[PDB]
Amino acid sequence: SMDVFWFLPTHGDGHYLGTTQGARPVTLNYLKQVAQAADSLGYHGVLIPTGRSCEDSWVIASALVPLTERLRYLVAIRPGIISPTVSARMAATLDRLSNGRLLINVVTGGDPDENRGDGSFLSHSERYEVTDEFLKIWRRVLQGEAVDFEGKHLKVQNAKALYPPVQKPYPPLYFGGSSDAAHDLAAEQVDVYLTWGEPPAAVAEKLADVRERAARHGRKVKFGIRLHVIVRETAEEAWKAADKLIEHISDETIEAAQKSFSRFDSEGQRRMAALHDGRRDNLEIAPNLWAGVGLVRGGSGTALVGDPQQVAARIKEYADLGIESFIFSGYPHLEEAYRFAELVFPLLPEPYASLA
Amino acid sequence: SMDVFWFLPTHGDGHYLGTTQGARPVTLNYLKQVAQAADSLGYHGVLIPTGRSCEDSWVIASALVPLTERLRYLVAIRPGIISPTVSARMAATLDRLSNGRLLINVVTGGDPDENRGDGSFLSHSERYEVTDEFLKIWRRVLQGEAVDFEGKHLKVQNAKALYPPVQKPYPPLYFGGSSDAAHDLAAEQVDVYLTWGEPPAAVAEKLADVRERAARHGRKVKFGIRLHVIVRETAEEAWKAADKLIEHISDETIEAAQKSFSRFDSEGQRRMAALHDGRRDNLEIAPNLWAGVGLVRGGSGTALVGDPQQVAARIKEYADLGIESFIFSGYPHLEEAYRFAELVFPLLPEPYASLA
Amino acid sequence: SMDVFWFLPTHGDGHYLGTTQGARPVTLNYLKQVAQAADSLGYHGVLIPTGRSCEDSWVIASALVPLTERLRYLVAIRPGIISPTVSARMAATLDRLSNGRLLINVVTGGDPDENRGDGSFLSHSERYEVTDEFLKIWRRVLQGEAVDFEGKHLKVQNAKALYPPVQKPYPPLYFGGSSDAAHDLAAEQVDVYLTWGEPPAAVAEKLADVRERAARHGRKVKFGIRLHVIVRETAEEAWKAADKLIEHISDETIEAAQKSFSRFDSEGQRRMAALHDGDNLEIAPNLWAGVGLVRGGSGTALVGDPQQVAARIKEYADLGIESFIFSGYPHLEEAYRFAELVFPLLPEPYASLA
Amino acid sequence: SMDVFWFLPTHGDGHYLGTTQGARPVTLNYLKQVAQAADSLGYHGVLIPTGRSCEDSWVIASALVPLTERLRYLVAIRPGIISPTVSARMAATLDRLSNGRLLINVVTGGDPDENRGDGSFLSHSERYEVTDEFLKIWRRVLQGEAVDFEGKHLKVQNAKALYPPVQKPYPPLYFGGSSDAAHDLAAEQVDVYLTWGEPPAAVAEKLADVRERAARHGRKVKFGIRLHVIVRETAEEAWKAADKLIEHISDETIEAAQKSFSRFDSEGQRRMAALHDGRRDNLEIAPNLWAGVGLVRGGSGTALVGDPQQVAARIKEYADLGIESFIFSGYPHLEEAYRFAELVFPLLPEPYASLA
Ligand SMILES: Cc1cc2nc3c(=O)[nH]c(=O)nc-3n(C[C@H](O)[C@H](O)[C@H](O)COP(=O)(O)O)c2cc1C
Ligand SMILES: Cc1cc2nc3c(=O)[nH]c(=O)nc-3n(C[C@H](O)[C@H](O)[C@H](O)COP(=O)(O)O)c2cc1C
Ligand SMILES: Cc1cc2nc3c(=O)[nH]c(=O)nc-3n(C[C@H](O)[C@H](O)[C@H](O)COP(=O)(O)O)c2cc1C
Ligand SMILES: Cc1cc2nc3c(=O)[nH]c(=O)nc-3n(C[C@H](O)[C@H](O)[C@H](O)COP(=O)(O)O)c2cc1C
């Protein structure tokens, strides 16, 4: 069992990092190009990022749903800046229009400055308290229940969603986060726990922690990983692309990016930035795991680099740990979606082996 | 100058009111039908209702935008249940994908039970205080300002919308409401003031009140009206159709709907229900102005009934009062969009006279 | 088993016959409206007419194929004005793009003036000879065979269609015609035999004739009927709609239509135009011939309440008719009217769609 | 003045020539991908090839017209296998549906076996006699005339097309062919004469000949060229890409392809295969003009290879001869459409300089 996702670059796209050379602006036409490419190639879905640097996820996902047949959309909900009852009605409507193709990514918000710009002034513990109260209302409302809820942060009275979703009991909940509060929330309410591309040993420890917490609640959760990928026909070509991707990066931009990550209140971001510490040398932190992406890009900071045999082998290693969802990306997002499907799909389990 | 809108029945559609006989469920295909009908017939735009009884406005409008060329979407924002910065980003993204076809309807929420289900426990004056603070943030954020705002209800710090909208300074704000708080808010911040289909004398008084208040703020506002329409080739056919529309309505339905409106906290809803009082006699409150819709339906509760000459004549009276936007609807919404465009457009000003 | 089709008005649409009042021109947007209506309402497919007065069937059908999900397209081929190998490749591409939603209507051409305008100067017997030779090449080419064929009219040598169709052995062949040559052709090569809306006794005789010939060829053919439909909630409303449909028709237009039909070398058109002789328009219970007063081709309509309309359909079904191709004025609104009033009274899956 | 076209691979696509390795099947989805890329990237149009090895041109263009906004479609008509009146009606319908985006490529048919497979048994002179009679009927029918014509090959009597086209007097006629009959037909009836990518000196001679013949008819024709393009950021990358494109070609495929080109009765095809003769050495017949494509591919068999500066300079040479249309292609067609648009458009005249 394996779900392979792609990524919609709603914050921008291009050939290189840290420079405007060869940059592609986010347009409806280009988003349509990437989404329809992923649809026809047979990817399970696409992850749509959310944040101040992105166009709105819900507008994009809804606009592309009628233009695609099978592709699923992993769209982010952001508790604390929208009413849970309103959020559930949006989730139901999009799930209904898409005929059950909506997936939910629970995003807590790691940048306090970004959160204060949205009107939320909560501490790290308070953000997860809101998310816990949010998910309880959202899950119960989508199951047809008239919800009365009075917690520390959220209060609703007779909350209903009159239009039930297609997927039961509700669209699957995906969630990522590395703090103790995050792991407790994942073990109790979510369906899939997502992690960024740490080395296999570190990933295994995070998964074991979630399993133990989930077992105490009598639940099991599935696991997914988010990874950039630079795959070519030969390993030499792949590594040249990795060097070419970050050649135009200045040392000033590396210093500014690391200082901005230090201001983030996110344990996942602190772990991702601690793999390189803004150092251009020794970026291969593990076999075929290259951390050059994290020099500038925020969030996902590691990439699998190599020929198809090497990339599939690293995928198999993550798969052997219990991971069933893989969310890949590449620069630029259109071309690399074709490249990954044509070079790696035949080496993956069904149905990806037969798609190519 | 005149803009003629149609209506997207996101809360359901059918041939009759108050019954499930001959009802059309809200599907993507059917909404596509109505929106594409309105686009090709030459309607200026469509109004999309919002509320607990509707599918989500933002998901619907975004899904239909790539499937239409010229048609504009009058979409509702609801201050108090969503962050103003997030709402601004959504408007910008939809305005960008549509290439400047987005119009905003500011909705305060007249049903206290619906609002408490959304997590809002505000009084009537507090709801208008929130909307005042919400609109101030939203308007400035869409103009490129990094906004700091600390009011009674909303507080943002470094609120930014990085993607500017297509329409300047922002997508136009349409607003409806009959209370004194509503008239102050409309005179200060909105672009078009909307009213439901009251008789011309009452409409003139509401328009005169708004003009006077807007002058104190050094502004002028445009005016629009919302009406159902039952137009046939002869007056007898129109009046026969109007009778058939409410033949299945029972007294229990009338009592249940009217008592439900008593719980509503809306001045505009209270004015609309005071026209008919839940009684089936004397439903023609003015020449060719029939209030039979408001027996069950909430919100717009009056319709123009007559032959094309009479309907066009009633439209001119409203235009002579200063009304420039007309938002029409009919049952069922697909067929009646064709009927109005084929029977009434040739009798209206340009460009509607030349479309046929 | 029953297939209910609708109709794409590619030659024009409106509310009334014989007048330009309330007419809807053929645009991409309006064609999109009718096709998407038919798709979402659950119609099996749409028949797309062909002729000098229509937009080209292949262009329209291709343009609507990516905008529809389940709807089938009954598209016409015209032997004698296009190479059979070229026609076969077009059928294959459209069938592949549509994922097997293409249906083929074989049209021989009943208007000699229109045929001479396209460059074909064949007699009535010559038209069916060309069609017979056309279909033999077309059917074999789509089955992957490199075809060598040298007939009286058509000659191909190493004719191949490299892209195989989705439907096997080829997209189904629908054909209509009342002559003895047409019946021989239908019994030998076609899959569905279509007739216009004659009264049941006349329809039954034509079906019996095709059945006997098909048994001699060791085949069975399915049967379909083409019918206009005017259905309202009560019979009085339906008949009022029928009267309103033809109120703008004078006798100058009637004489122009009948004189035009006197030049058609078509057996199915003369049988259709002999039911009214240019009053007493109800030639059978709930079968009204007012449509054929101007419109060439389909000339009868079922008029009545849903119970009456379904009953007339049930009578046709009991004779062996499995395909029904309906239409109404205007074609968008009436597609909804038929689906909401008659589908619940029809067999599966139409009973469950509404 | 310059119009830059791309190409729809309706006969198949892939990463390499002469092998099925890394091949992309022609699907509706993939054609939608290529066409929409060219539309959003700003190409004037796409050329759609015709022939036994392709999916039908008219079905494809009709399928993509509603899915694109500005892109033009250069579609081929083959006289001798379809009635001119029927063909004119198809052009009118597609021109009307596309709102005047249809361009016509007149194709005579160079393969006698393909022509005999379609039922045409004509010699080279007879094919041009048929085409001459075909175009006269087609052009006049589209101008509203009821045409009576009795020629050597074609006879129509009261031929009419009731639906007039959008472009007047008819959609522009593009034509390619190098024989004396082709040059007479182009100078007499067509709007744009197209040639394949021969060296600049040979192209200049052909253009001067077509100019002289057209002047005797008191006409001027525009000129276009069809070329493959392999452009990368550096010249070394381009030539390695050119070498890799034909590395998997075996000599049993070159011999089987050259023997089939001999059977062709096509002057232009004969000149194209005379540039290389099937040899793998000295394929650069002119500065940055590489003939490696014509080793297998029938028809267009020369490519521009180099860095953006070199490719732009070769384009300028052809333009200096009077060429205003450039029809480009690349492997694979989706990726290379972006590559050409991002590397060469800024070096071209307006509007291509401002698109990037
Ligand atoms: C796969 C994945 C996807 C994420 N997507 C987003 C996103 O779109 N926007 C965002 O702000 N944070 C995103 N995050 C980060 C977390 O959702 C959250 O914002 C925060 O960083 C978690 O804090 P914590 O790790 O200290 O518990 C994502 C994390 C993961 C693992
Ligand atoms: C044209 C128009 C459209 C409206 N649309 C909505 C709507 O979609 N949802 C809603 O809850 N209220 C709608 N309203 C009503 C107001 O937005 C609001 O809910 C309330 O009635 C205003 O309160 P007030 O009348 O006491 O000033 C609309 C009003 C008008 C005139
Ligand atoms: C259901 C049906 C559909 C037809 N559709 C067309 C059409 O679209 N265009 C057309 O020219 N003829 C059409 N025809 C007519 C026949 O295909 C053909 O032109 C002629 O009338 C048959 O010749 P015959 O009756 O003399 O044997 C149709 C006939 C039937 C019964
Ligand atoms: C730019 C261009 C495009 C062409 N496209 C086609 C095509 O789509 N199909 C085809 O069969 N021939 C095509 N040809 C070739 C001619 O249309 C014709 O078939 C033949 O090869 C020319 O004959 P001639 O050179 O002896 O005069 C094309 C030629 C050119 C220059």
Coordinates of N, CA and C in Angstrom, one line a residue, chain A residues 66-167:
Chain A
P66 N -12.9 20.8 -10.8 CA -13.6 20.5 -12.0 C -12.8 20.2 -13.3
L67 N -11.5 20.5 -13.2 CA -10.6 20.4 -14.4 C -9.8 19.1 -14.3
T68 N -10.1 18.2 -13.3 CA -9.3 17.0 -13.1 C -10.3 15.9 -12.8
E69 N -9.9 14.7 -13.0 CA -10.8 13.6 -12.9 C -10.5 12.7 -11.7
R70 N -9.3 12.3 -11.5 CA -9.0 11.4 -10.4 C -8.1 12.0 -9.3
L71 N -7.4 13.0 -9.6 CA -6.4 13.6 -8.7 C -7.0 14.1 -7.4
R72 N -6.4 13.7 -6.3 CA -6.9 14.2 -5.0 C -6.1 15.4 -4.6
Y73 N -6.8 16.2 -3.7 CA -6.2 17.5 -3.3 C -6.1 17.5 -1.8
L74 N -4.8 17.6 -1.3 CA -4.5 17.7 0.1 C -4.4 19.2 0.4
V75 N -5.5 19.8 1.0 CA -5.6 21.2 1.2 C -5.5 21.5 2.7
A76 N -4.9 22.6 3.1 CA -4.6 22.9 4.5 C -5.7 23.7 5.1
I77 N -6.1 23.2 6.3 CA -7.0 24.0 7.2 C -6.1 24.6 8.3
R78 N -6.4 25.8 8.7 CA -5.6 26.6 9.6 C -6.4 27.0 10.8
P79 N -6.5 26.1 11.9 CA -7.3 26.4 13.1 C -6.8 27.7 13.8
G80 N -7.7 28.4 14.3 CA -7.4 29.7 15.0 C -7.6 30.9 14.2
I81 N -7.7 30.8 12.9 CA -8.0 31.9 12.0 C -9.3 31.8 11.2
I82 N -10.0 30.7 11.4 CA -11.3 30.5 10.8 C -12.2 29.7 11.7
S83 N -13.5 29.9 11.7 CA -14.4 29.2 12.5 C -14.4 27.7 12.1
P84 N -14.4 26.8 13.1 CA -14.5 25.4 12.7 C -15.7 25.0 11.9
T85 N -16.9 25.6 12.3 CA -18.1 25.3 11.6 C -18.0 25.7 10.1
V86 N -17.5 26.9 9.9 CA -17.3 27.4 8.5 C -16.3 26.5 7.8
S87 N -15.2 26.1 8.4 CA -14.2 25.3 7.8 C -14.8 24.0 7.3
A88 N -15.7 23.4 8.2 CA -16.3 22.1 7.9 C -17.2 22.2 6.7
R89 N -18.0 23.3 6.6 CA -18.9 23.4 5.4 C -18.1 23.6 4.1
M90 N -16.9 24.3 4.2 CA -16.1 24.3 3.0 C -15.6 22.9 2.6
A91 N -15.1 22.2 3.7 CA -14.6 20.9 3.4 C -15.7 20.0 2.8
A92 N -16.9 20.1 3.3 CA -18.0 19.3 2.8 C -18.3 19.6 1.3
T93 N -18.4 21.0 1.0 CA -18.7 21.4 -0.3 C -17.7 21.0 -1.3
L94 N -16.4 21.1 -1.0 CA -15.4 20.7 -2.0 C -15.3 19.2 -2.1
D95 N -15.5 18.5 -1.0 CA -15.6 17.0 -1.1 C -16.7 16.6 -2.0
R96 N -17.9 17.3 -1.9 CA -19.0 16.9 -2.7 C -18.8 17.2 -4.2
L97 N -18.3 18.4 -4.5 CA -18.0 18.8 -5.9 C -16.9 17.9 -6.5
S98 N -15.9 17.5 -5.7 CA -14.9 16.6 -6.2 C -15.3 15.1 -6.2
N99 N -16.5 14.8 -5.7 CA -16.8 13.4 -5.6 C -15.8 12.6 -4.7
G100 N -15.6 13.1 -3.5 CA -14.7 12.5 -2.6 C -13.2 12.5 -2.9
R101 N -12.7 13.6 -3.4 CA -11.2 13.7 -3.7 C -10.5 14.7 -2.8
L102 N -11.1 15.1 -1.7 CA -10.5 16.1 -0.8 C -9.8 15.4 0.3
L103 N -8.6 15.9 0.6 CA -7.8 15.4 1.8 C -7.4 16.7 2.6
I104 N -7.3 16.6 3.9 CA -7.1 17.7 4.8 C -5.7 17.7 5.4
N105 N -5.0 18.7 5.4 CA -3.7 18.9 6.0 C -3.9 19.9 7.2
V106 N -3.7 19.4 8.4 CA -3.9 20.2 9.6 C -2.6 21.0 9.8
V107 N -2.7 22.4 9.8 CA -1.6 23.2 9.9 C -1.7 24.1 11.1
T108 N -0.8 24.1 12.0 CA -0.9 24.9 13.2 C -0.3 26.2 13.1
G109 N 0.7 26.4 12.3 CA 1.3 27.7 12.1 C 2.6 27.9 12.9
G110 N 3.7 27.8 12.3 CA 5.0 27.9 13.0 C 5.6 29.3 13.1
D111 N 5.1 30.3 12.3 CA 5.7 31.6 12.3 C 4.8 32.5 13.1
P112 N 5.2 33.0 14.3 CA 4.3 33.8 15.1 C 4.1 35.2 14.4
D113 N 5.0 35.7 13.7 CA 4.7 37.0 12.9 C 3.6 36.8 11.9
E114 N 3.7 35.6 11.2 CA 2.6 35.3 10.2 C 1.3 35.2 10.9
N115 N 1.3 34.5 12.1 CA 0.1 34.3 12.9 C -0.5 35.7 13.4
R116 N 0.4 36.5 13.9 CA -0.1 37.8 14.4 C -0.7 38.7 13.2
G117 N -0.2 38.5 12.0 CA -0.8 39.2 10.9 C -2.1 38.6 10.5
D118 N -2.4 37.4 10.9 CA -3.8 36.9 10.8 C -4.7 37.1 11.9
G119 N -4.2 37.8 13.0 CA -5.0 38.1 14.1 C -4.9 37.1 15.3
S120 N -4.1 36.1 15.2 CA -3.9 35.1 16.3 C -2.6 35.5 17.1
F121 N -2.8 35.6 18.4 CA -1.7 35.9 19.3 C -1.4 34.9 20.3
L122 N -1.5 33.6 19.9 CA -1.4 32.5 20.8 C 0.0 32.0 20.9
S123 N 0.3 31.4 22.1 CA 1.6 30.8 22.3 C 1.6 29.4 21.6
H124 N 2.7 28.7 21.6 CA 2.8 27.4 21.0 C 1.9 26.4 21.6
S125 N 1.8 26.4 22.9 CA 0.9 25.5 23.6 C -0.6 25.9 23.3
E126 N -0.9 27.2 23.2 CA -2.2 27.6 23.0 C -2.7 27.3 21.5
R127 N -1.7 27.3 20.6 CA -2.1 27.0 19.2 C -2.6 25.5 19.1
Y128 N -1.9 24.6 19.8 CA -2.3 23.2 19.8 C -3.6 23.0 20.7
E129 N -3.8 23.8 21.7 CA -5.1 23.8 22.4 C -6.3 24.2 21.5
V130 N -6.1 25.2 20.6 CA -7.1 25.6 19.7 C -7.3 24.5 18.7
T131 N -6.2 23.9 18.2 CA -6.3 22.9 17.2 C -7.1 21.6 17.7
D132 N -6.8 21.3 19.0 CA -7.5 20.2 19.6 C -9.0 20.5 19.7
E133 N -9.4 21.7 20.1 CA -10.8 22.1 20.2 C -11.4 22.2 18.8
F134 N -10.6 22.7 17.8 CA -11.0 22.8 16.5 C -11.4 21.5 15.8
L135 N -10.5 20.5 16.0 CA -10.7 19.2 15.3 C -11.9 18.5 15.9
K136 N -12.1 18.6 17.2 CA -13.2 18.0 17.8 C -14.6 18.5 17.2
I137 N -14.7 19.8 17.1 CA -15.9 20.4 16.5 C -16.0 20.0 15.0
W138 N -14.9 20.1 14.3 CA -14.9 19.9 12.8 C -15.2 18.4 12.5
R139 N -14.6 17.4 13.3 CA -14.9 16.0 13.0 C -16.4 15.7 13.4
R140 N -16.9 16.2 14.5 CA -18.2 15.9 14.9 C -19.3 16.5 14.0
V141 N -19.0 17.8 13.6 CA -20.0 18.5 12.7 C -20.1 17.7 11.4
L142 N -19.0 17.3 10.8 CA -19.1 16.6 9.5 C -19.7 15.2 9.7
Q143 N -19.9 14.7 10.9 CA -20.6 13.4 11.0 C -22.1 13.6 11.3
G144 N -22.6 14.8 11.0 CA -24.1 15.0 11.1 C -24.5 15.4 12.5
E145 N -23.6 15.6 13.5 CA -24.0 15.8 14.9 C -24.2 17.3 15.1
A146 N -25.2 17.7 15.8 CA -25.4 19.1 16.2 C -24.5 19.3 17.5
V147 N -23.4 20.1 17.3 CA -22.4 20.2 18.3 C -22.6 21.4 19.2
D148 N -22.5 21.1 20.5 CA -22.4 22.1 21.6 C -21.0 21.9 22.2
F149 N -20.2 23.0 22.1 CA -18.8 22.9 22.6 C -18.4 24.2 23.3
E150 N -17.9 24.1 24.5 CA -17.4 25.3 25.2 C -16.1 24.9 25.9
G151 N -15.0 25.3 25.2 CA -13.7 25.0 25.7 C -13.0 26.3 26.1
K152 N -11.7 26.2 26.3 CA -10.9 27.4 26.7 C -10.8 28.4 25.6
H153 N -10.8 28.0 24.3 CA -10.6 28.9 23.2 C -11.8 29.1 22.3
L154 N -12.5 28.0 22.0 CA -13.6 27.9 21.0 C -14.9 27.6 21.7
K155 N -16.0 28.3 21.3 CA -17.3 28.0 21.8 C -18.3 28.1 20.7
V156 N -19.0 27.0 20.5 CA -20.1 26.9 19.5 C -21.3 26.3 20.1
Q157 N -22.5 26.6 19.6 CA -23.8 26.2 20.1 C -24.7 25.9 18.9
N158 N -25.1 24.6 18.8 CA -25.9 24.1 17.7 C -25.2 24.3 16.4
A159 N -24.0 23.8 16.3 CA -23.2 23.8 15.1 C -23.6 22.6 14.2
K160 N -24.0 22.9 13.0 CA -24.4 21.9 12.1 C -23.8 22.1 10.7
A161 N -23.5 21.0 10.0 CA -23.2 21.0 8.6 C -24.3 20.2 7.8
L162 N -25.2 21.0 7.2 CA -26.4 20.3 6.6 C -26.0 19.4 5.4
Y163 N -24.9 19.7 4.7 CA -24.5 18.9 3.6 C -23.4 17.9 4.0
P164 N -23.7 16.6 4.0 CA -22.7 15.7 4.5 C -21.7 15.5 3.5
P165 N -20.4 15.2 3.9 CA -19.4 14.9 2.9 C -19.6 13.6 2.2
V166 N -18.8 13.3 1.2 CA -18.8 12.1 0.5 C -18.0 11.0 1.2
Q167 N -16.8 11.3 1.6 CA -16.0 10.4 2.4 C -16.4 10.3 3.8

